[PDB]
Amino acid sequence: IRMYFEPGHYTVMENCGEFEVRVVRRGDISTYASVEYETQDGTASAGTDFVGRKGLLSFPPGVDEQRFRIEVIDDDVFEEDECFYIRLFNPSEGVKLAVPMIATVMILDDDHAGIFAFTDSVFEITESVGRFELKVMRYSGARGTVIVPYWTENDKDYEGARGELVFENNESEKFIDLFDVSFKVHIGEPRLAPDDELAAKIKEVEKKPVQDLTELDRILLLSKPRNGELTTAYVRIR
């Protein structure tokens, strides 16, 4: 005998350049064997998401596995999770096809804007030793510029803080500088730079009645940055 994929399932980052797909030969190794593979489309398109590939996996006498590089294509357009597969045909004569003989590889986008939130909800700190950066994390993922307001609230102890953080591309983290009592500090809602080419196209899609949005457009709409659970932090001062 038998010949079958293993791993029979690979998960892969759109930016992984490529990755190995491994195949196994059980049963009578002793003699050369072989088998073919062909990438074939799922939701992930050969052409846009990966490259098509038929091939011949040769198994000289004494080898019960072959790997083989598949290329995952990278781009800057937000897409949901996508799929594509790889099938074993044409085994050599000695041998039967097993389970699985269809490998599944999924492409994870990384063109989201994306989702913004604090790390924890409470941070204990020190009567007066100055400053001390309050982190803000950007979750999966880190495409486009995203601007995002910040202001503080009272609960004399600190100086009030306001602004708009600017996460440029692949900016995943940024910091608010401040500057037993507590106060809260909020984050508003993320928006793109008003004038980043994307913010427009989306504005365009954002008028086509939803019933009109091309599938492409519907997925362009949820490319937009969002907020997470905790959009507020308390600061305890002791």
Does 14 interact with Ca ion (rule: CB under 5 A)?
yes
Can residue 165 be called a binding residue for Ca ion (CB under 5 A)? no
Annotated binding site for Ca(2+): 14, 49, 74-75, 77, 79, 82, 109-111
Please identify, among the stretches 30-38, 68-76, 144-152, 170-178, the one whose residues bind Ca ion according to the rule CB under 5 A: 68-76
Q: Quick one: which H or E segment has residue 200?
A: helix 197-205
What six digits make up the tokens of 142?
């880190």
Structure tokens at 118: 């604090």
Which 69-88 positions form the footprint of Ca ion (CB under 5 A)? Answer: 74-75, 77, 79, 82
169-195: burial string, b at 16+ Cβ within 10 Å, e else: eeeeebebebeeebbebebeebbbeee
- For residue 203, report the phi and psi dihedrals to the nearest 5 degrees: -60, -40
Nearer to Ca ion (CB atom), residue 108 or residue 237:
108
**19 and 73 in contact (C-beta within 8 Å)?**
no
The distance of closest approach from Cβ of residue 162 to Ca ion in the complex, given in angstroms and rounded to an integer, is 34
Assess 109 for contact with Ca ion (CB under 5 A).
Answer: yes
List the interface residues with Ca ion, window 29-58 (CB under 5 A): 45, 48-49
- With beta carbons less than 8 A apart as the criterion, state whether 26 and 4 touch: yes
Q: Spell out where 98-190 has E strands.
A: 102-108, 115-117, 122-125, 132-139, 146-154, 162-167, 173-178, 181-187
Segment contacting Ca ion (CB under 5 A): 63-71, 104-112, 151-159, 194-202?
A: 104-112
By CB under 5 A, which span of 89-97, 111-119, 188-196, 228-236 interacts with Ca ion? 111-119
Q: Site for Ca ion (CB under 5 A): which residue of 41, 64, 71, 110? A: 110
Instruction: Please report whether residue 107 would count as binding Ca ion according to CB under 5 A.
Output: yes
Where does residue 97 rank: exposed (0-12), middle (13-18), buried (19+ CB within 10 A)?
A: middle
Which residues would be at the binding site for Ca ion (CB under 5 A)?
Answer: 14, 45, 48-49, 74-75, 77, 79, 82, 107, 109-111
